C-alpha cells in the first residue's frame, strides 16, 4: 500500500550473484542473466573477501557500456550482505573542498574495516509511578512499573539530587544504567496523555515498557575503524560524524588507533572484520590520487578494492599520457582484471523479462520480440526504459497487457541518442555553438 | 495584483482525456508530438513506483523547453515538490560540487503530515500554580464571546514567565507547538497610570478557542539540514549564538542513512505520507564532467526523484575536458541514461497565436493590422523579440491618448529598440571602433 | 590622547516584520516536526542501541557505549546549542585526570578473563606522552611545553 | 544595535544588552558557572 | 566655501534624463544633450520601471566609447528619484572570494526590489515644564505645547526611563509611548539660558502618527539568517544564504501581497561593464529573468564581436546569443561638432569656468581629433594655468599650453615607438 | 592472527658479517649489489654522524625498491623513527606544500627521555586533624598536621600532611570511603569515587564505583618516554589544559594545521640541547622515506635543496619508477627519473634491476609458504613461467585465488589444473590492453 522511502530502480532486481555451491554460475537466477565468466570470477573474489586473511587486494572490472559491470558489483554487495562493511563511492566524490584527495581516499579506506566488540550491560527501563523523599542527608524511594511488574528502589543521596535536576514526575518513562548512574527520560506514557491540555514545546508519547524491569546481558557492537579515528580528532569530535566537518585527521592519531586495535585482537577483546571499497567510474581519479593507491593497497589493514571502468586506451587525468583504461601502468599490475562481454539476443530477452517481473508488467510475446530488436539495434538501457512508458500508455488506453502498438507509440515519442543526434544535424545552425 | 512574467500564460499541458494534444489550450499552442510526451511523464510521476528515471528536452533557443517543464509543475500542482535549478549553481564556495547535486536531489522528495492546529487567545483572568513543587498551572482566558479555563504544563508556564505575562495581559497560546505570544495589556486597565511604557490592545472579539485541520509539507533535505549541525536553540536571548557564524557543510553519508530509517518508521505508523517529486536541472550543459559522471550514480539510486534536463547546444565541447565534443554538450555515457524529447521551431501562424495570447495576458488591446506586423517581424527576428515589443508599443499608444496598438506604434518602436541580429550587423561595419 | 568615538543611529525594524516576518516564529509549528523526526531523540537511541533483532547487526550510536555519553546527554548536546557544548567540555577536562591515573597505574591484568571493552575505552587521547594529564603528572616534560 | 517599536521587542533587546542568561554570561565572564560560584567566596581561601 | 563629500565628478552635471511630456527629447536640458534616439528609448524604459506591472525584463545600452551610454543610465537614475530601488554594480564586482559568483547575482537582484508597509504609532511630543519623583516609586510630570498643557502620573517603567535619561525642565522631548524610548530635541528658546535650542511644538501633546516604511527583499532574507542577522547587512559576512530560506520568504511575501498587508515596489539593476561576466554568470541571468520578483535590468557595454569570457566562442557585444534574445538593444551614436561644443559648455558651467569663443572653438577641434573625454579634461587644467597667470577668462594660449604638457594616448603611442627598445616587454 | 600483505615476508637485508649479500636470506632474494648498498646506508643511519644525506632507489616497476626500503627499517628496528610518506601527501588543503615537507623532516627525529613517577593512592579511612598541646599566643587552637589513613589490597598506613591540604579536601567532595590519589611531585589531591566495597548500600546511586587499589599505598616507577621533535612543535604551537577564554574558544573551534614559525623551531632546538647536555635525554636521528617522489612539484624539489643541506635533517630515502618524464609544475622540462638535475646531483643513486626466471620462481615459493599455501612442483614450474611471460606481481597475485578454487574442488594443495583455470578468469595489463586495441570503437 503505502510508498516507502526506497522504491523500484535500476539495479533493483539483482538479489545476489547467482552461483551454485561449486561457484558454477546458473544461466538465470537471483535476477541475473549470462555474464558467466565474470560471475565465476566475482564468486572467487567474494570467497576471498569472506575469508579476510589477506589485505590490500584489488580487482578491476572492465568492458563496454551496458554490459553489467555495476550490476555485478551491486549483486556482489547483496551476496556479501550486511554485517560486513561495503562502501560505494563514485570516482568524482573525492574532490573535496575541505580536505585533500589523499584524505578523501584515506577515509574511504578506513570506513571499510569494522571492529567487533562485546560489552557487558545492565539497564532499567520503565514508567515511573511515584517519587517520595523526606528530610531527617536526604532519604527517599522511587517506584517503577512495567506491564509485567511494579517495584520499588531505596535510592541514595546523589540520585535524589539527579531526579530533581531532570524533573521526573509520575507517568514519565525513564531509563538508567546502574553501573554509570545516569538518568535519561524517553517520554510520557500514553495512559497519561490528558493530565494537561497545553503541552510544552517538546514532549513525546511512548508505550509503557514490558518484560523484566532490570535486564542484564552481553551486547555486541560493530563500529567502523574510521569512527575511532574521528572521535579522537578533537575534544567533542563525534559531532563531526554527522556534520561531515572533519579536517585532515593528524597522522599520529591513525597510527595510534592501528596500534590499539592490533593490541585488542591479540588480547581477544576485539576482532577485525575486513570489508570492501567499491569505486564506480574510477577512470576519473587523478594521477596524484592513483599514485596514493600504490601505497594504500599495502597496509596490514586495508579493504579489498573493486573498481569499474568503461574507457578504452585514453589520457590519464592530470597528464598528457595515454594508457589502458585511463589508469597508470604502475597500478594496473597491482590489480587483477575481469572483463565483461556484450550480450546476445537470447540474453537480451531474458533480462527484459526480469525487468517486467520487477516493474509488474505483462507483455505480448510479439511485443517482447519487437522490444528485443530495438534493444539490439540501440542500447540495452533504452529498451529497459521503454517498458515503463509502454505500461503508462497502455493504462491510458484502458488495456492491461502491452501490445506491439504500445511499443511503437513510445518509440515514436522518445528518441535514443542515434535518432536525436541525426535530427540535430538537419537544423544544426539553429542550435548554439557548433 | 500579481506581476506578469515570462511564462505566466502557460497553465498546463492541456491534453485531452485520451492523452493526445489539442492545437491551442491551457495557454500553449502547437508542439503536439513533443508535449504529448510530457503527458506520459506526468503519469509516471503520479504513479510513485519509480526512482531516478530521467528525461532530456532538446532543441534550439526559443522553442518551448522551459515552458513545457513549467507546464508539468502545473499538472502536478502544489502537492508534489518541484525543485528548479540552473547548472551554474553547482559551483559553490562552501561545499563540493557533488554535495550541491545531492542536496538538490533530496529537496525533490517530500513528507506530507497532518495535524489539528488548536489556538487559545484572550485576556488572562487568572494564573494559579498547583506536594512540594508545581505540578500544573491553571489559567483563565476571556474574550467578547466568553470565558474558558485551561490546564498548562510547567514548560508552558516557563514560557509565559519568559514573555513577562501577568494577569490582564492579552495572550495567544498555540496548544500543539507550545508557542506563546504576548500581545499587550488589555485596554480595561489602560487607566492604571496616565503614562506607562506598555501598549494596550482591545479585548479580542473572536472566539476564545479555535480548531483547524492543517497539512505540513517538509522535504527530506529539511530533515538532513536541521539534524546535521546542532540546532542553535536561540530564541535570541543567548549571546553564545553571536560567536559562531553559520556555513554550509558536507552532510555525511551516515546521517542520511539514519534519516531514511526514521522516516520509514513514521510512514509505517501512518503519521506521514511520502510524495516523490521532480528536480528540474535546467541549463544542464553548464555542468562539469565530474558532475556529469556523478549523475551516473545518483540516477541509479533506488531513492532518487524524477529528473528533468534541458539543453540548447549543438555538438559543443564538454566543460572540463578541453577537447571532447558531444551532442547537446552532454557526455555520451550519460546521454544513454535519459529518454530524449525533441522540440521544434515555430511556423509564422504559431507565433501569431503566441503573440495574441501574450497580449491578452499582459493586458494590451491590439488591432488586427498591428498584430500582422508583429507576426512578420517575428519571422525576420525571433519570437522572444516580437513578444518584447508589446509593452513599449502600448506605452506609446497611451502617451498618444489611444487604447489599442496600431501599425504606427509598433513601427515606431521597431526603429527605437534593436535586435541582436541587426545590432551585430552594425558591429561588423564599425569594426575598428569598439 | 584617546581614539575618536562614534555611534551610528540604530537599525530600525518595523512592527510588521518583527511580528510576521521572522521564519523562526511563523514556521514554529512546521519546525517542530523536524525535531520530532530526529534520529537524536532518546526514544530512537535506546531502540537502536539495545533492541536490535540480529546478533550481529550494525547500528549507529554504538560508539556512545565506549565514549562516556548517555542518550539524554547526546540529544541535549544536539539541540540545546553552544552552551551545552561549553559545559560538557568543562566537565570533560575534569574527567580526563581521573582517566589518566586509572589508565597509567591500574594497567595490569584483564578484568574479565580477557573479554569486553570497558566504558571510556575509545578515549585514547590521554595515552599520548605529551597529553596535559601526563605532562602535569611528570615534572620534567612540563618544561618542554613552555 | 536595532530599534523596534514594540514592548516585547524592547524586552528582548534589553536582555541582550545585559547578557543573555546568567549561565551564558558567567560562562564567558568567569569561565564556568562552577568557577563563578567559587570566585564569589575565593576571598576566604588561602590557596585558591 | 565648505566641501561636501560629493565634490564635482565625471557625471555630476547630469541632473535628469530630460524630456517633454510626450517623451520627446529636447535638444539640451537637465545637463544633457544630443542622443535623440537613445534618450527617447530610455524614456520609454523609465515609464515601464515606474509603472511596475511587468517583471523580468532587460535592455542593453551599446555603442562606441564616449557616447553617453553610462550618461543616459546615470541620468535615468536621477530621473527615477529616491523611494524606488536602483542598484548599480560593475560586472567585475561579482567575483567574490567570500561568496559564490551565482550568489552575488542572486543577492544583487534582491537588493533592488522592495516590500512597502504602513503602520501607526502613539507618540508624545512637547516641552517638559515640571518633573517630580519620590523615595516602588511614583512620580508626575507636566508637558506643554504652544496650544495646550497636561499633567501625567507616571508608572514604574517610565520612571526608570525618565530618570535614566536625566530629563530637565525646559527640554523638548518626544516619547514612543509603546516602548519607553525618549528622544530629546534640545531646549526651548525661553529657557536657553542657565546644547541646542528650538521653539516648542504645535498641536496636541499625544499624536497618533502614521509611518510608511520599506525594506529590500534581500534585507528580509539576511535578518532571518542568524541571531542578529542585520549586522551582516553592514559587515558583508552574508555568506551563501540557504535557498530553502529564500523559497520560504517569497511565499510569505506573496501572501502579504494578496491579503493586502504589504505591497511590492519593483526596481532597477544597473549591471555596468556586462561584457565581463563569465558564461556561467550569463547562464544564470538567462533564468533569473523569469521570476515574478525579478527587477528590470539595464546593461551597458562597448565591445565589438569578441570572445565571451571563460570560452573560445565569439559573439556580439561579448555576450552569448542565449542572453541577447531576452533583451532589447538601444544603440548610441558618436557626436558632431555642435554637440561636442555644447557638452564642453555644460562642463564649463558645472566646473565654474569661463572661456573665449575662440577657446571653445579650438577645444572643440581637439575634442574631435582626440575623443571628448580628453578635451573635457583640458578644461580644468586650462583654468589652473590661467589662475597661475593671474588671468580670468581662458584664452587660446592657455589651452595650447596644456595640450603640450599632458598627452593623449595617440600622441603618447607615437612618442613611445621612437624609443621602442628602452621600454620593457614589447 | 595478523593479516598478510604485499611485503609481509621482508624480514631484513640478509648479509654476511663481511657485508656481502646472501643469494636468499631474511625473505629477500637477488639484487645483491643493491642489497649490499643498503647495507652501507644502514651503517650510515646507525652512525649518528650525519645529516641530510640522501639516496634514490631507481628502477622499473616491480623490481624491489619498496621492499628494500622496508628492509632497512627492519635492520634499524623499532627504537629509531622511520617515517613513511608518498609524494602525493604534500598537496594539503590546510597548509602550504613546503610546510608539509618540513613537518615530515621533524617527524623523523626522536627524543628518548626518562623520569620517575611517584603517587599515593587508597581508600580514605580517616581524616584526623591533629592539634598541638597549646595554641600559639592569643589563638584558640592550632593544627600541626593532618593524618590521612589510606588502605589498599596490600595493607593500610597513615600519611602525615601539611594543614593546607584540608582546603583541597573540601574543594574535592572527599568523604570517608572514597578512593583518592596524591601526586607526590606536586602535592595536589584528586578524588576517583566511592570504593566498590559500598556498591550495595542502596538499590540505586548516581555514582560509578571504582575497585580498591592493588599494591602498596605509595608507588614509584621509572619510565622512558619517546617523542618526535614534531610533537614538541605542535604541543607548543597549540597549547592544552585550558582554563581561559582563549583556550576554550580554541578547543570548541574546528582544529586546523598552521604554518609553524621558524622561531618556535629555533626555541625548541635551544632547550632540547640543554637537556641533552645535562644527560637527561637521548636523541635518535631517524629516516624519512619519501616514496613515489615523481609526484612532487618543482616548488617542492626546489625547497628540498635547502632542506637536505640543513645541519639538522634526517637521512632521506627517495624512490621513483619514471624514465625521462616532464617535471610536474613546468610545461616541457623533461628530466631523468622525473626529478630536476640539480636535485639529482645531491643524491647517491642505488640502481635496481629486473629478475631472471629462476629468481621469480624462488620468490613465488616464498610468497606461497608465507601466505599459508601448499603447491606442487609441476604447478610452480607453470606459475614461474607465467611470471616470465607477464610480471612478478601478476604471477604472485594468482596464488590465493588458486588456493580457493583448489579448496572448493576438495584438495589441500595447488595443482597444474588450478592455475591454468585461474589464468582463464583474470587477465593482466598486457592482455587487457590488446583486447582494448581490437575494440577501440566501443569504449
Ligand atoms: N508552445 C508555446 N506556447 C506558448 N508559449 C510558448 C510556447 N513555446 C514557448 N513559449 C513562450 O516563449 C518563450 C520561450 O521560452 P523557452 O521555453 O523556449 O526557453 P528555451 O530557449 O527553450 O529555454 P531557456 O529557458 O533555457 O531559454 C517563453 O515566453 C514561453 O512562455
Ligand atoms: N547480467 C545482467 N543481469 C541483469 N541485469 C543486468 C545484467 N547486465 C546488465 N544489467 C542491467 O542492465 C543495465 C546496465 O547495466 P550496468 O551494469 O549498469 O551497465 P555498465 O556495465 O555500463 O556499468 C542495468 O539496468 C542493469 O541492472
Ligand atoms: N550626452 C551627453 N551629455 C553629457 N555628458 C555626456 C554626454 N555623452 C557623453 N558625455 C560625457 O562622456 C562621459 C561618459 O561617457 P559614456 O559614453 O557615458 O561612458 P562609456 O563610454 O564608458 O559607455 C562623461 O564625461 C560624460 O559627461
Ligand atoms: N628481492 C626481493 N625478494 C623478495 N621479494 C621481493 C623482492 N623484490 C620484490 N619482491 C616482492 O615483489 C613485489 C614487488 O616489489 P616492490 O617492492 O613492491 O617493487 P617496486 O617498489 O619496485 O615497484 C612485492 O610483493 C615484494 O615484496
Torsions phi, psi for A237 (to 5 deg): -65, -25
CA separation for the pair D19, D2 (Å, rounded): 16
CB of A76 closer than 8 Å to CB of A48: no
Domain with CATH 1.10.8.60 in chain F: 355-438
In angstroms, what is the resolution?
A: 3.4
DSSP β-bridge partners for residue F150: F124, F157
Could you tell me which chain C residue has the CA closest to the CA of A228? C122
The residues pairing with A120 across neighbouring beta strands, listed in sequence order, are: A218
E251 and E369 within one domain: no
Q: How far is the CA of A179 from the centre of ligand 3 (A)?
A: 83
Are the C-beta atoms of residues A163 and A157 closer than 8 Å to each other?
no
User: E134-146 burial, b if ≥16 CB within 10 A, otherwise e?
Assistant: eeeeebbbbbbbe
Q: Degrees (nearest 5) of the Cα angle F61, F65, F71?
A: 145
Same domain? For E358 and E311 the reply is no
Is A407 a domain residue? yes
The single-letter DSSP state of residue F202 is: S
Q: Long-range contacts: B182-187, Cβ < 8 Å, 24+?
A: B182/D7, B182/D8, B183/B121, B184/D7, B186/B123
Domain limit, last residue, from A343, A362, A396: A343
Phi/psi of residue F54, each to 5°?
-145, 155
Count of CB atoms situated within 10 Å of the CB of E305: 14
Residue pointed to by grid coordinates 555542468 = B287
Distance CA F318, CA A371 (A): 60
Helices (H), F188-261: 229-237, 245-252
Rounded Cα–Cα distance for residues F168 and F188 (Å) = 8
Q: Is residue A184 one of the residues assigned to a domain?
A: no
With CA atoms as reference, the chain C residue closest to E253 would be C21
User: CATH number of the domain that E279 lies in?
Assistant: 3.40.50.300
Distance of CA E117 to CAs A163, A323, E52, E114, E208, Å? 51, 67, 17, 10, 17
Q: Residue written as cell 567487533?
A: A116
Using CA atoms, how far apart are residues C71 and C61, in angstroms rounded to an integer? Answer: 9
Distance CA A69, CA A75 (A): 10
- Calpha distance E15→E29 (Å, rounded): 9
CA dihedral A42, A48, A52, A53 (to 10 degrees): -160
Domain with CATH 3.40.50.300 in chain B: 1-107+227-345
d(CA C104, CA C86): 28
Of A246, A349, A326, A281, nearest to A88 by C-alpha is A281
Chain F closest CA to A398's CA: distance in Å? Answer: 42
Q: Are B423 and E331 in contact (CB under 8 A)?
A: yes
> Could you tell me if residue E67 is inside a domain?
yes
Taking Cα atoms as reference points, which of E52, E107, E72, E26 lies closest to residue E298? E72
Residue F54 near residue F290 (C-beta atoms within 8 A): no
Please give the grid coordinates belonging to residue B65: 523547453
Atom in ligand 1 nearest the alpha carbon of residue B30? 1
- Output the ligand 2 site: residues, CB below 6 A: A 10-11, 14, 32-35, 65-71, 310, 351, 380-381, 384
Interface contacts C/D by beta carbons within 8 Å:
34
For the beta carbon of residue F97, count every other beta carbon within 10 angstroms. Answer: 16
For residue A237, the Cα-to-chain-centroid distance in whole angstroms is 23
State whether residue B235 is helix, strand or coil.
coil
Exposure on the CB side of residue B241, measured as CA atoms within 13 A: 20
Give the E-state strand segments of B360-433 in sequence order. Answer: 365-366, 404-405
Does the domain made of F108-235 have the CATH classification 2.40.50.360?
yes
The order of strands in the sheet holding B306-311 is B82-86, B278-282, B306-311, B54-58, B339-342
What architecture does CATH give domain F1-107+236-354?
A: 3-Layer(aba) Sandwich (3.40)
Inter-residue contact B153 to A199 (CB < 8 Å): yes
Residue A397 included in any domain = yes
Q: Are residues A233 and A327 in the same domain?
A: yes
- Asked whether residue E15 is assigned to any structural domain, the reply reads yes
**B173: Cβ contacts below 8 Å, ≥ 6 apart:** A198, B119, B120, B121, B150, B156, B179, B180
Strands E139-144 and E114-132 come out as: antiparallel
User: Could you give the CA distance from residue A233 to residue F251 in angstroms, rounded to a whole number?
Assistant: 11
**B417 — contact with chain E (CB < 8 Å)?**
yes
> Are residues E425 and E288 located together in one domain of the fold?
no
A117, A122, A162, A239: best mutation site toward chain C, by most C Cβ within 10 Å?
A117
CB contact under 8 A, E44 and B196: no
Q: What are the CA-CA distances from residue A259 to residues A262, A263, A266, C123, F232 (Å)?
A: 5, 6, 11, 14, 21
The shortest CB-CB distance from E178 to any of D2, D3, D5 is to D5
Q: What stretches of B258-305 adopt beta strand conformation (E)?
A: 272-276, 278-282
Q: Which residue minimizes the CA distance to atom 11 of ligand 4?
A: F64
Our measurement of the distance from residue E54's CA atom to the centroid of its chain's CA atoms, rounded to an integer in Å, reads: 22
Domain boundary, last residue among A309, A343, A377 = A343
Whole-number Å distance between alpha carbons of E102 and F23: 67
Pick the CATH number of B346-429 from 1.20.1250.20, 1.10.8.60, 3.30.56.10, 3.30.1180.20: 1.10.8.60
Following DSSP, what letter does each residue of E310-328 receive, concatenated?
TSS-EEGGGS-HHHHTTEE
- Rounded to an integer, what distance in angstroms lies between the CA atom of residue B409 and that of residue B404? 9
Domain that holds residue E244: 9-113+216-335
- List % helix, strand, coil for chain A (3-state, nearest 5): 40, 25, 35
Residue numbers in the known binding site of B are: 59-66
Q: Are residues E238 and E286 in the same domain?
A: yes
Give the nearest ligand 4 atom to F29 CA.
3
Contact E390, E383 (CB under 8 A): no
**Closest C-alpha among B339, B337, B254, B248 to residue B298:** B337
Number of Cβ within 10 Å of residue B10's Cβ equals 21
Phi, psi of B273 (to 5 degrees): -130, 160
- Cα angle for residues F193, F199, F204 (degrees, 5° grid): 100
Are A317 and A402 found together in one domain? no
Do A307 and A383 belong together in one domain?
Answer: no
Domain B108-226 fold is OB fold (Dihydrolipoamide Acetyltransferase, E2P) (2.40.50)
How far is the CA of F305 from the CAs of C44, E140, F104, F313, F331, in angstroms? 59, 85, 15, 12, 21
CB A228 within 8 A of CB A257: yes
- Beta strand segments in F210-278, E: 218-228
Q: Pick from B64, B85, B344 the residue to mutate for probing ligand 1's pocket: most ligand atoms within 8 Å of its CB.
A: B64
Chain C closest-CA separation from residue A171 CA (Å): 15
Helix or strand (DSSP H, E) at E206 = strand E206-216
DSSP symbols for F3-64: PB-TTTT-----B-TTSPBPSEETTEES-HHHHHHHHHHHHHHHH---SS-EEEEE-STTSS
Query: Helices B407-416 and B368-380, interaxial angle, to 10°?
Result: 30
Q: Where are the alpha helices (DSSP H) in F173-244?
A: 229-237
CA-wise closest residue to A274 among A305, A307, A302, A306: A302
| E224 lies in the same domain as E268 | yes
Top-level class of domain F355-438: mainly alpha
Cα torsion at B53, B57, B58, B64 (round to 10°)?
180
Question: For the purposes of burial, counting CB atoms within 10 Å of the CB of A331, is it exposed (0-12), middle (13-18) or buried (19 or more)?
Answer: buried
| Sign, CA torsion A140/A145/A150/A151 | negative
Residues contacting residue A246 through CB under 8 Å, at least 6 positions apart: A99, A230, A233, A237, A240
Do E365 and E342 fall into the same domain? Answer: yes
Q: Is residue A154 part of a domain?
A: no
Distances (CA, A) of F139 to A295, D47, F134, F166: 77, 21, 9, 19
Q: What is the DSSP string of F50-90?
A: -SS-EEEEE-STTSSHHHHHHHHHHHH-TTS-EEEEEGGGG
H/E run at residue C84: helix C82-105
Q: How many helices (H) and strands (E) does chain F have?
A: 15, 14
∠ CA A127-A129-A135, rounded to 5°? 130
A388 and A293: one domain?
A: no
Q: Are B428 and E305 in contact (CB under 8 A)?
A: yes
Nearest alpha-carbon partner for C86 in C72, C76, C96: C76
Q: Of A292, A108, A106, C66, whose CA–CA distance to B252 is shortest?
A: A108
Residue A404, C-beta contacts closer than 8 angstroms, at least 6 positions apart: A364, A366, A367, A370
E302 plus E359 within the same structural domain: no
E200's grid cell: 516648542
C124: left (phi over 0), alpha (psi -120 to 50) or beta: alpha
Domain boundary among A306, A323, A343: A343
Kindly state whether residues E227 and E373 are assigned to the same domain.
no
- What residue ranges line ligand 3, CB within 6 angstroms? E 10-11, 32-35, 65-71, 300, 302, 343, 372-373, 376
Q: How many CB atoms lie within 10 A of CB D18?
A: 11
- Classify domain B1-107+227-345 by CATH number: 3.40.50.300
User: Does some domain include residue E75?
Assistant: yes
The CATH number linked to A403 is: 1.10.8.60
342-381 in chain E: CB under 8 A from chain B: none
Polymer length of chain D: 48
Is the CB of B6 within 6 Å of ligand 1?
yes
Query: What is the SS3 assignment for B126?
Result: strand
Residues in D closer than 8 angstroms to F243, CB to CB, are 31, 35
Q: Where would I find the H helices in F356-428?
A: 357-371, 377-389, 392-397, 399-408, 416-425
Name which of B336, F440, F426, B324 is nearest A312 in CA terms. F440
Contact F393, A334 (CB under 8 A): yes
Strand partners, F145: F130
Query: Can you read off the three cell numbers belonging to residue B129?
Result: 500554580
Q: How many domains does chain E have?
A: 2
Query: Side-chain half-sphere of E341: how many Cα atoms within 13 Å?
Result: 12
Amino acid at each position: 500500500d503505502v510508498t516507502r522511502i526506497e522504491r523500484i530502480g535500476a539495479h533493483s532486481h539483482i538479489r545476489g550473484l547467482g552461483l551454485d555451491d561449486a561457484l558454477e554460475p546458473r544461466q538465470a537466477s537471483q535476477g541475473m542473466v549470462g555474464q558467466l565468466a565474470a560471475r565465476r570470477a566475482a564468486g572467487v573474489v567474494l570467497e576471498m573477501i569472506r575469508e579476510g586473511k589477506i589485505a590490500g587486494r584489488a580487482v578491476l572490472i572492465a568492458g563496454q557500456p551496458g554490459t553489467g559491470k555495476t550490476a555485478i558489483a551491486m549483486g556482489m554487495a547483496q551476496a556479501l550482505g550486511p554485517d560486513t562493511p561495503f562502501t560505494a563511492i563514485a570516482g568524482s566524490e573525492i574532490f573535496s573542498l575541505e580536505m585533500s584527495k589523499t584524505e578523501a581516499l584515506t577515509q574511504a579506506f578506513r570506513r571499510s574495516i569494522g571492529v567487533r566488540i562485546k560489552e557487558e550491560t545492565e539497564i532499567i527501563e520503565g514508567e515511573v509511578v511515584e517519587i517520595q523523599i523526606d528530610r531527617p542527608s536526604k532519604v527517599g524511594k522511587l517506584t517503577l512499573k512495567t506491564t509485567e511488574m511494579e517495584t520499588i528502589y531505596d535510592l541514595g543521596t546523589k540520585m535524589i539530587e539527579s531526579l530533581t535536576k531532570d524533573k521526573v514526575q509520575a507517568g514519565d518513562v525513564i531509563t538508567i544504567d546502574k553501573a554509570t548512574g545516569k538518568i535519561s527520560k524517553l517520554g510520557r506514557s500514553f495512559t497519561r496523555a490528558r493530565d494537561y491540555d497545553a503541552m510544552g514545546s517538546q514532549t513525546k508519547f511512548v508505550q509503557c515498557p514490558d518484560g523484566e524491569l532490570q535486564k542484564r546481558k552481553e551486547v555486541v557492537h560493530t563500529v567502523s575503524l574510521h569512527e575511532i579515528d574521528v572521535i579522537n580528532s578533537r575534544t567533542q569530535g563525534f559531532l563531526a560524524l554527522f556534520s561531515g566537518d572533519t579536517g585532515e585527521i593528524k597522522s599520529e592519531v591513525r597510527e595510534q588507533i592501528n596500534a590499539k586495535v592490533a593490541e585488542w585482537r591479540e588480547e581477544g577483546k576485539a576482532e577485525i572484520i575486513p570489508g570492501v571499497l567499491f569505486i564506480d567510474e574510477v577512470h576519473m581519479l587523478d594521477i596524484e590520487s592513483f599514485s596514493f593507491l600504490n601505497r594504500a593497497l599495502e597496509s596490514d589493514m586495508a579493504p579489498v578494492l573493486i573498481m569499474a571502468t568503461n574507457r578504452g586506451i585514453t589520457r590519464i587525468r592530470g597528464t598528457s599520457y595515454q594508457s589502458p583504461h585511463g589508469i597508470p601502468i604502475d597500478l594496473l599490475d597491482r590489480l587483477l582484471i575481469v572483463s565483461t562481454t556484450p550480450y546476445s539476443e537470447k540474453d537480451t530477452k531474458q533480462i527484459l523479462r526480469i525487468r517486467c517481473e520487477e516493474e509488474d508488467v505483462e507483455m505480448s510475446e510479439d511485443a517482447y520480440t519487437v522490444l528485443t530488436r530495438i534493444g539490439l539495434e540501440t542500447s540495452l538501457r533504452y529498451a529497459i526504459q521503454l517498458i515503463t512508458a509502454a505500461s503508462l500508455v497502455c493504462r491510458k488506453r484502458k488495456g492491461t497487457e502491452v501490445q506491439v502498438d504500445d511499443i511503437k507509440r513510445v518509440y515514436s515519442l522518445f528518441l535514443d541518442e542515434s535518432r536525436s543526434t541525426q535530427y540535430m544535424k538537419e537544423y544544426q545552425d539553429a542550435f548554439l555553438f557548433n | 495584483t500579481q506581476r506578469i512574467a515570462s511564462h505566466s500564460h502557460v497553465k498546463g499541458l492541456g491534453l485531452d482525456e485520451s492523452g493526445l494534444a489539442k492545437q491551442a489550450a491551457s495557454g500553449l499552442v502547437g508542439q503536439e508530438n513533443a508535449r504529448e510526451a510530457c503527458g506520459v511523464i506526468v503519469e509516471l510521476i503520479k504513479s510513485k513506483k519509480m526512482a531516478g528515471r530521467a528525461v532530456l528536452l532538446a532543441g534550439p533557443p526559443g522553442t518551448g523547453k522551459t515552458a513545457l517543464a513549467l507546464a508539468i509543475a502545473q499538472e502536478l500542482g502544489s502537492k508534489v515538490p518541484f525543485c528548479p535549478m540552473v547548472g551554474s549553481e553547482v559551483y559553490s564556495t562552501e561545499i563540493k560540487k557533488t554535495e550541491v547535486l545531492m542536496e538538490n536531489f533530496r529537496r525533490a522528495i517530500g513528507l506530507r503530515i497532518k495535524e489539528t492546529k488548536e489556538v487559545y487567545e484572550g485576556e488572562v483572568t487568572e494564573l494559579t500554580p498547583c506536594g512540594k513543587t508545581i505540578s500544573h498551572v491553571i489559567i483563565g482566558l476571556k474574550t467578547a464571546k466568553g470565558t474558558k479555563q485551561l490546564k498548562l504544563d510547567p514548560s508552558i508556564f516557563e514560557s509565559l514567565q519568559k514573555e513577562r505575562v501577568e494577569a490582564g495581559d492579552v495572550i495567544y497560546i498555540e496548544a500543539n507547538s507550545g508557542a506563546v505570544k504576548r500581545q499587550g495589556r488589555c485596554d480595561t486597565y489602560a487607566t492604571e497610570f496616565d503614562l506607562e511604557a506598555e501598549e494596550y490592545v482591545p479585548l479580542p472579539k473572536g472566539d476564545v478557542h479555535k480548531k483547524k485541520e492543517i497539512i505540513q509539507d517538509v522535504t527530506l533535505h529539511d530533515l538532513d539540514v536541521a539534524n546535521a549541525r546542532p540546532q542553535g536553540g536561540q530564541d535570541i536571548l543567548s549571546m553564545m549564538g553571536q560567536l559562531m557564524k553559520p556555513k554550509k557543510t558536507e552532510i555525511t553519508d551516515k546521517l542520511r542513512g539514519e534519516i531514511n530509517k526514521v522516516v520509514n518508521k513514521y510512514i509505517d505508523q501512518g503519521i506521514a505520507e511520502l510524495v516523490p517529486g521532480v528536480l528540474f536541472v535546467d541549463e544542464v550543459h553548464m555542468l562539469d564532467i565530474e558532475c556529469f559522471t556523478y549523475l551516473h550514480r545518483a540516477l541509479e539510486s533506488s531513492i532518487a526523484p524524477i529528473v528533468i534536463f534541458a539543453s540548447n547546444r549543438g555538438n559543443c565541447v564538454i566543460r572540463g575536458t578541453e577537447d571532447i565534443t558531444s551532442p547537446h554538450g552532454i557526455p555520451l555515457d550519460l546521454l544513454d541514461r535519459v529518454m530524449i524529447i525533441r522540440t521544434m521551431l515555430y511556423t509564422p501562424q504559431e507565433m501569431k497565436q503566441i503573440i495574441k495570447i501574450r497580449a491578452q495576458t499582459e493586458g494590451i488591446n491590439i488591432s488586427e493590422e498591428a498584430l500582422n506586423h508583429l507576426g512578420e517581424i517575428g519571422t525576420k527576428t525571433t519570437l522572444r523579440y516580437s513578444v518584447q515589443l508589446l509593452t513599449p508599443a502600448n506605452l506609446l499608444a497611451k502617451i498618444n491618448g489611444k487604447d489599442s496598438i496600431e501599425k504606427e506604434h509598433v513601427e515606431e518602436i521597431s526603429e527605437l529598440f534593436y535586435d541582436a541580429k541587426s545590432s551585430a550587423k552594425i558591429l561588423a561595419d564599425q569594426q575598428d571602433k569598439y | 590622547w584617546s581614539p575618536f568615538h562614534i555611534s551610528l543611529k540604530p537599525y530600525h525594524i518595523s512592527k510588521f516584520i518583527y511580528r510576521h516576518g521572522q521564519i523562526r516564529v511563523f514556521n514554529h509549528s512546521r519546525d517542530r516536526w523536524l525535531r520530532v523526526l530526529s534520529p537524536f531523540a532518546p526514544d530512537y537511541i535506546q531502540r537502536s542501541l539495545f533492541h536490535r533483532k540480529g546478533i550481529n547487526e550494525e547500528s549507529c550510536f554504538s560508539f556512545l557505549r565506549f565514549i562516556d555519553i548517555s542518550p539524554a546527554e547526546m540529544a541535549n548536546l544536539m539541540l540545546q546549542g553552544l552552551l551545552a557544548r561549553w559545559l560538557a567540555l568543562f566537565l570533560s577536562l575534569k574527567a580526563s585526570y581521573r582517566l589518566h591515573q586509572l589508565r597509567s597505574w591500574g594497567a595490569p591484568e584483564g578484568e574479565s578473563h580477557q573479554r569486553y571493552l570497558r566504558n571510556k575505552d575509545f578515549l585514547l587521547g590521554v595515552n599520548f606522552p605529551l597529553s596535559f594529564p601526563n605532562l602535569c603528572s611528570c615534572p620534567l616534560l612540563k618544561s618542554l611545553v613552555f | 544595535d536595532s530599534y523596534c517599536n514594540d514592548r516585547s521587542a524592547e524586552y528582548e533587546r534589553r536582555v541582550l544588552k545585559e547578557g543573555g542568561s546568567l549561565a551564558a554570561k558567567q560562562c564567558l565572564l568567569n569561565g564556568a558557572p562552577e568557577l563563578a560560584a567559587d570566585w564569589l567566596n575565593r576571598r576566604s581561601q588561602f590557596f585558591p
